[PDB]
Amino acid sequence: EPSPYVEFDRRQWRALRMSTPLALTEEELVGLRGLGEQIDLLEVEEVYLPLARLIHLQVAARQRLFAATAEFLGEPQQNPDRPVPFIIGVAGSVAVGKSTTARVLQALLARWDHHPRVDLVTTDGFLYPNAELQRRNLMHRKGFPESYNRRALMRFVTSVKSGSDYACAPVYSHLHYDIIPGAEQVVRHPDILILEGLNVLQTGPTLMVSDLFDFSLYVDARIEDIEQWYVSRFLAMRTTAFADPESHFHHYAAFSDSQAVVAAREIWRTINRPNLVENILPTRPRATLVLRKDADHSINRLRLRKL
């Protein structure tokens, strides 16, 4: 029976690369790769290149839609030096690799013929300060939809897509586990804005950020595998992030493999998994493209929305 989607295996998907040129060195790929990710240039070729193609094909097609409405309104026919920003959302669980996926996407798109302005913004910057979370009693729901200033987020994305000359966003520090006082990320009328976050594909009783997406990505994986990557990355951070005396979780550095496994599992069981199950996964059906990852972090299956 009919379906809104169409599924590919890596073999079928890479065929769609065509003449798309690889403009990324191995050393650049490394500075984009997050702890735990196994992505190599081969994957950038067989998975991320066809994706970059499909996107530029549509950046063109999506512009005709705003054209048509501008014509209808009798408005001018706006500046080709400043078209309507193309918004891309990247969603998925904690520790599934969405940040790496989003950084890689930004790199490939910024290296297209013209050299379009491609900004990347994470929703982390819109989380409430820890003091405000404790106030709202949400310290153990950090990551959940309500742990974000969704109003400020929508204001930011709306501002940008509406053609503002510049829009600002707060900044989050993973090291201190909190928002940074006075820090800001300035986005200046980019050609493309990638919004990466747990909650980005979310819908609701009010117009939301996902309603402004022109394209969306959902980095997927078997839940038991994501837990493994989570715990695994947690033990690994004892000697990276947590090893920093300034780290909010510096106490975790001295944990034993066993103590660490227990702690990481409890956090996953009580916080990230519930959120993934109750809020993130339910948004997956709406993603334009779902990148399915095998236990080895490898992307071997994809689900595209044709409707």
**Contact of 219 with 100, CB cutoff 8 Å:** no
Nearer to Na ion, 95 or 192 (CB): 192
Contact 307, 2 (CB under 8 A): no
Distance (Å, whole) CA 55 – CA 61: 10
Q: Could you identify the residue written with the tokens 């309507």?
A: 84
Query: Binding mask 189-228 vs a copy of itself (x if CB under 8 A, - otherwise)?
Result: --------------xxxxx---xx----------------
Q: Does residue 44 have a known ligand-binding role?
A: no
Nearest residue to 144 (alpha-carbon basis) of 122, 121, 168, 128: 128
Nearest residue to 89 (alpha-carbon basis) of 210, 225, 203, 204: 210
97 assigned binding-site residue: yes
For a copy of itself, the binding residues in 246-275 under the rule CB under 8 A are none
Residue list 11-70, contact with ligand COA (CB under 6 A):
34-35
Residues 6+ apart with CB under 8 A from 237: 35, 243, 249, 252
CA angle 160, 198, 98 (to 5 degrees): 90
Residue closer to Na ion (CB basis): 2 or 76: 2
Judge residue 9's burial from the number of C-beta atoms within 10 Å of its C-beta, 0-12 exposed, 13-18 middle, 19 or more buried. exposed
Q: How many residues bind Na ion (CB under 5 A)?
A: 3
Instruction: Select the binding partner of residue 188 from a copy of itself, Na ion, ligand COA, none (C-beta < 5 to 8 A, by kind).
Output: Na ion
> Interface mask (CB under 5 A) for Na ion, residues 112-131, using x and -?
-------x------------
Contact 279, 145 (CB under 8 A): yes
Stretch that binds a copy of itself, among 97-105, 157-165, 180-188, 219-227 (CB under 8 A): 157-165
Q: Is 60 in the site for a copy of itself (CB under 8 A)?
A: yes
Place of tokens 């103590």: 259
Total chain residues near a copy of itself (CB under 8 A): 43
- Where does this chain bind a copy of itself (CB under 8 A)? 1-4, 6, 15-16, 50, 53-54, 57-58, 60-62, 64-69, 71-74, 155, 158-159, 161-162, 164, 203-207, 211-212, 282, 285-286, 306-307
- Where does this chain bind Na ion (CB under 5 A)? 119, 187-188
Residue list for the binding site: 92-99
